[PDB]
Amino acid sequence: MDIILGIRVQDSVILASSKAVTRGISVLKDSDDKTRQLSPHTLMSFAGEAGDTVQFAEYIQANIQLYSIREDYELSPQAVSSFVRQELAKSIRSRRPYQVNVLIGGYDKKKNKPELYQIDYLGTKVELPYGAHGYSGFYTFSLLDHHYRPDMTTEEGLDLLKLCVQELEKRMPMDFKGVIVKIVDKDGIRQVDDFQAQ
């Protein structure tokens, strides 16, 4: 599968997502951004079935933006993830389920704390310090189980991810073409344009 990683440090949540989009024998694109901003402080990454993936991300984005406008308020990260979980949980028992896994990284301005939610296509949600979807988790959970620390700074988090991406670029069979990294904190969502060699 594609690489979808997330790590929650002291005051931010960082999401790293592979850039490759491959079909059969060809890597069609190497600059794919597997993410959608749901609200100024909530970001969602996704991996899964070819078309379902974006259709789901955009459908969720549309709903959150609608709520924001209607209520002139921003739902908390926990609120948004519960909404996403329910959508997936409905889907799994529908005619053709959405085959999409997501990571929701958000900064809760009311609690002043970053939050990372991992949710699979079945609607299985869990809140974690770090998470991953696909085969990635098989090399990153133990890596992070070892190197991760609660009080880490955003900069330490990025170095921690770099350690993850290097492990993946070493042992994973596929060429996922690097990752796009985004930070979610009290000031919003920004993209680290320099990870191709940080």
Added chain:
Amino acid sequence: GSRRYDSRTTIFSPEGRLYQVEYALESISHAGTAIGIMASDGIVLAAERKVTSTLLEQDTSTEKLYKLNDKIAVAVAGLTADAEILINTARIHAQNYLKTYNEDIPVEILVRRLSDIKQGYTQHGGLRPFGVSFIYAGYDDRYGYQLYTSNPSGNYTGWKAISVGANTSAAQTLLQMDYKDDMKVDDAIELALKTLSKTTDSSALTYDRLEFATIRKGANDGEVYQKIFKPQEIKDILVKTGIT
């Protein structure tokens, strides 16, 4: 055909008014008075039980104050049965929200949904509107204590102090006269009772003719608490405030 017997409950008068809504409001104006007062540390809901008897069981009775949530309650002025239909759907909407977002429903979202249901009976369906007006008392972490009001038209507004039902004109003037932004729950409790006391179409204002409720954030805790006063409790607060 049937057309012959259709009252057409959803049409405009030549003046641009909705007949049924206006008539439903007229109905509401004869209902026991209900008052809502918002303070810095809480909200007070009080209502006068229209018509009573020696044999009426007041301990098991409730015709005006209903709990919609653990953080929201309403005072009713109008057809009790109609109110119950709306109250129940309001309770369901609150739980759907909780199940969806894992957060209690913000007071206004719930009030707006209920008001929207009412608005519908106003524009389509050919059915009579609900002869009910509500005073919502609730609390959420975005606006704190809030007081709203909705009537047959589906329109709703926020207030510091408001009344619905009979003699609201007199009640409003009295409220607009003694209310003060920095009031306190206890001040409000007293203001509410005094107002009802001067607007009642009855001889005196006894406890068996009242329903009281308060939504406070008990200092010794940190959470919000709703309290629908019990007969005895009303009798007490009645003597204390000097109405005996």
Added chain:
Amino acid sequence: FRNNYDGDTVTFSPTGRLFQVEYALEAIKQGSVTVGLRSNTHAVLVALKRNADELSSYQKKIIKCDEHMGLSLAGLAPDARVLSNYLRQQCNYSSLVFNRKLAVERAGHLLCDKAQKNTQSYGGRPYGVGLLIIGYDKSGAHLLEFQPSGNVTELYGTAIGARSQGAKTYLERTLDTFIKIDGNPDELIKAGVEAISQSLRDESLTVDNLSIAIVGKDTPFTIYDGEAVAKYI
């Protein structure tokens, strides 16, 4: 009286009348005249096309339903479009399913029943148009008269519309004559134009004003308009 019983088609008057149906029939009378007549080999339709302005066209009044059937209308045009379309479908069904050309007599029964439904139910309205149906089937030439009341009748000839009474008396007179115009279409048409002109009064049938249609033994239902009818004026 009436005013209290003409509100809809689902109400009988104290004398057993259906005013909405009668009012619909009135739309026909207000319609331009059209005539129909048949021999034993052919059936002809002659209709007077009416125009709004001298800048407008003369609204068509003849609709082809199949290679062997067609009709002329008097009254609400849209209602004629609906009914003729239903007729086109019934003719079509007969061919596709049974490889059989629909009998004019059956077409009449089908129309009668379709109109009858809009006279016993609430919400609907009777059709406001009269129709003259001509056709050649397995039993020769035929002419039918359709009234919004649902009444359809087979005749040797007839006319409907404004002043239709003129042409009708003429045909009832010329009967023994035209009924024998077999093997000669031009004669049957002329006999038709003569019957129709018996209802003129305003003007005289011109080229872009006259409309004729014929069907027969070896003649698929075809419509003639303009220059094509010149040789008959």
Added chain:
Amino acid sequence: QFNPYGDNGGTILGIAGEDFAVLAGDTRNITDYSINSRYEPKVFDCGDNIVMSANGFAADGDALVKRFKNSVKWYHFDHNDKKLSINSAARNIQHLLYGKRF
């Protein structure tokens, strides 16, 4: 189980000349190793100077041709007897066929 399709054989051929065109087809209809008919027309004149043949599963070919012929009929009814040009017939056939895409 039930198979909604069958193969009736046959072969058809169409060549276009500068000011003419031809559509040919054998007249044999078969099922497996037997002959159903030695003469069962398979090429039809659909009106408006168009000839057509739908070869393969004959029941489907007949239903199609029948549906197209009826299409021409209605084209006249709905567009003041306008002639259906060959290019317009082609697009029309595409929709008839794609209508049963599944």
Added chain:
Amino acid sequence: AGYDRHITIFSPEGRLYQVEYAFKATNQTNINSLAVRGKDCTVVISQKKVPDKLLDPTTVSYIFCISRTIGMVVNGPIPDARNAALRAKAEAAEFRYKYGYDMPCDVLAKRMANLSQIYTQRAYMRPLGVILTFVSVDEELGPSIYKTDPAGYYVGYKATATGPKQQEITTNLENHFKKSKIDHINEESWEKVVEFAITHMIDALGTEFSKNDLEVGVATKDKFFTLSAENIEERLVAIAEQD
């Protein structure tokens, strides 16, 4: 406002005129009927009037066989009566299918009464202008008479009468039971119960009957049937050899 008399909604007096007018229709046939309970049978008697000579007397009836065990006599216009009979049959057949046993006389009555109550509350359905008397020898209750009207009301009777001269027949029957002190004709055979029925029909109406002026339906354990002109004539003869 004045339409509270065309559809079934309340009048300022809390009355349902359409239901009252429906009751009026039940006498339109100017026929009287009565029902009595025997020791182990139930008999229903109804006047039979055939004015037109062009009519086939055999097709003029207001007694119906709803099921092998239930009989129903109707007081009211024939079309509504047949509407009611068809429904009752369908209802009786369905009950047996779903619940495994024969629909009891009182249950069918309640069911038809409920259906009637509905026409009384929903505006698009008119009440039927008929009164239905159901009879049978219920396997649990014994001889049974249950009658339903356009109001959706129904109850069981010891005996009952219906029609224009219902009151005369009723008081006649009332007097007989005040006397006998029992709630049924203490006769062992249905023939005699039928004779009792016709006898009192004559006393109360002050009229004599030929074999073609009556119509008789009888209910016994496991069967309900109607008598023929001849079965009745035999009955009329018997009563004649007493007066």
Added chain:
Amino acid sequence: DRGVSTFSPEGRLFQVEYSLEAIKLGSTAIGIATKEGVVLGVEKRATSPLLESDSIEKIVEIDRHIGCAMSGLTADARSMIEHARTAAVTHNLYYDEDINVESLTQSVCDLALRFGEGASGEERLMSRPFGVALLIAGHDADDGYQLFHAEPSGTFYRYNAKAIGSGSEGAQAELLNEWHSSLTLKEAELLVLKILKQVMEEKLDENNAQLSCITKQDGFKIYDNEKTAELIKELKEKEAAE
């Protein structure tokens, strides 16, 4: 009350007739057909000087070869235009060709009588007839340039020239005398501009009136204000010339 599809004692449908009355109160619309194209002109009729007159769209394109002008309850025309555009585009998808102007018109008119509270004939879900009349102009290979008048009654007439709206009776009289089988497109333009000027309460200028035409060569085009301004000036001059 009385059904929305009731006949009057004269054999007319109340709702359709009353519908026509609303169309009389509408802005004027005029169309003139010539062997060089068809011109469509309309009276903007803004209701206040603060209203941006160019946001008044009473002349719309149906397809490259078919244009349309409206008069009456113009809001009622939107679904008609949408239906027409869809019919024209759809026809082209099914037949790889242009929809004939008459066919397009007939389609629009099929919507007309689809109103009622449950009329036994199909599923006519529309509470009332449309309160707008339309002038449909276009060109097709078989019948050349054409102008049709589609009414809420469902009937559509073909005209060499036609006027609808408040000043129609007057304008129609004018068109009767002015029209002839050999008018040029230019003559038709000035002629539309002229007659609009006579019936309009306001002094006709390039801001309260709008022209458009449909030519086989360039299809339907709505003249921009500058282009019409010059045509207006040219009219004033030819009028003052005698």
Added chain:
Amino acid sequence: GTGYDLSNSVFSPDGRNFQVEYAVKAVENGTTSIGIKCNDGVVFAVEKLITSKLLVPQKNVKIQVVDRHIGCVYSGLIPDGRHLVNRGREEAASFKKLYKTPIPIPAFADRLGQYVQAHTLYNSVRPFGVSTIFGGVDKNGAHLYMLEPSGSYWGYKGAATGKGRQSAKAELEKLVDHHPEGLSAREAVKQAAKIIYLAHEDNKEKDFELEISWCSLSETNGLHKFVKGDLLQEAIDFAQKEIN
């Protein structure tokens, strides 16, 4: 009050359904038609007013067949009649499909009966404007019926409806009295032609066309058939002869 006659299913203060009664007027205003039950079949005859010489003779048939053994004729609004027959046909087809045997006349009568009675139950429909005479032969004999707009029907020995129903009924009554043993199909056909002629006096203004049909176990094998040619003329004459 009044207005009880403006809506179909309404009971008037005297328990009547005025719309059904007005439907009857439409029937009495129609052509006369009859039916005669013979010893092994039934005969149907009807008056066909010749509006003009233009009406192709013998072409506008009025008697209709249902299944293969039933005949139906009616007076009133012809379209309503066809409507009722179409229903009868669907009704008969359904019965045969499930029970195999063609539908018995009594059974068939009730099918039409219930359907017609149904049209007096709601104000969304109008009652039928026709009285229908129909019948045929079945497993146990011949049966003749007449159905009124109210849905009322009974079996008949002879029946008539329409403009001249009184003349007809008078004639039918004579036959009934002078033939207790029973008329024959052959006789009934003539007798029917006579009654139509006699009953034509109540419309003697317009010329007419006679139409007869019959269903006899011996004469038609139990199948409904129209009387044509020789047998028809022979009956026409028998009438023309006794009309003087």
Added chain:
Amino acid sequence: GYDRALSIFSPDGHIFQVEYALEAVKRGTCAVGVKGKNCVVLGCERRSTLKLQDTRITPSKVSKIDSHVVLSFSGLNADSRILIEKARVEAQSHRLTLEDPVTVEYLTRYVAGVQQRYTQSGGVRPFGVSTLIAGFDPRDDEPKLYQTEPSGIYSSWSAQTIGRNSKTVREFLEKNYDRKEPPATVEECVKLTVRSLLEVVQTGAKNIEITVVKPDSDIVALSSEEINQYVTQIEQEKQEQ
């Protein structure tokens, strides 16, 4: 089930339910909108039949449909909610399929269509509402102001007003608004707006709210003071004469 034709033609060719719908608008509080050279301003008046409200929570008159477009109205408040919700939904749907937010005309054309539809559908009465919709098309700096009414009719205005006494305030704008030189500033635009409202609000610092909309989703509502300050400077322009 209910499909009675409520909006139908009368003999004179009018549709009274739509006409009476307008009467409900005339009765609503006044709303006005004026477009500057680089902005659009929306002002609304605040009734005073009852005063003791909680301004924080009581629903405001100007509503954001999307981040670059707003909608105000005059008429039935309950009805307006229905139109606003449908507008907000259509806005998100449009971004979802066209991958671009709605233009102000598009959004207006949509609201108007909903209104029109309720004028010829069975079982429903027309919306007793008229709206003013303003904002800036995506990546555009040219201000937009449109007005819709019960019938479904819509059009753009340099400045417009709806509601009670809109007659008065329109007169003011017609002889105070120059298309030659539109309020070249956010300030002078807001001033022309307040002036127009004062012609009818009759001294109401708390009875007049204003919202300023600039290009690129720059929307903000003025506070009592900010507004009250404009009123102040306005009453002096008068006295200084």
Added chain:
Amino acid sequence: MTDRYSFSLTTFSPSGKLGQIDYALTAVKQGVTSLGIKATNGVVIATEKKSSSPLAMSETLSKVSLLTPDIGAVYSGMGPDYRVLVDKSRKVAHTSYKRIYGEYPPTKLLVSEVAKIMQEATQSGGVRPFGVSLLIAGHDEFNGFSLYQVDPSGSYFPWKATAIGKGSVAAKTFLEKRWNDELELEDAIHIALLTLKESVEGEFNGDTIELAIIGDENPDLLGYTGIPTDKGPRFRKLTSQEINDRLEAL
């Protein structure tokens, strides 16, 4: 066909009155009197069996019905309307409660369900309100004994004691005199009989009076044994004989 009456038949009049509900109440007023009295260990509801003919068997007509083994109902007004309401109440107790929680509904909730059904006949299209007022008496573990009144509007209220119908005004006045919070069931039955006598014109005996109570469990009316937690229904209709015995001590 097809019910095309999709609009309300009960609407507000200029004065704010809901005509049809008012009229329904007037129908209830003409109805035979019925009452209910709550004791400390039970509740009694009663009414007069106003036989419409001496030929009718008044026993085949019950005005007092069991809804659940611990809840009973009686009424005043249109008998047929009551009958269908009882059918619907018995069923809603199952569909909306027993089939979900495996236990019968507490009195207040079942009353709430009935009230809902009645409110709908006040607003739904094509119907008229029910022309009845019910008195529902019952018992449930967490609420004990209770008595409720449900009116045509759908409104309901708890009572210590009350009467509805014909002579309700007088009957209520009489109850206010004899009622106290210490009455035992037998006392209430006695007061019930006295109150009902003032409303009855003719014969007053166990055959003309219908009376039932909600009291102790009747294991003898359970139908089976072997399950300790199942002690029987609390609803019991008094027999004609049981009524007469208490009338001699009247």
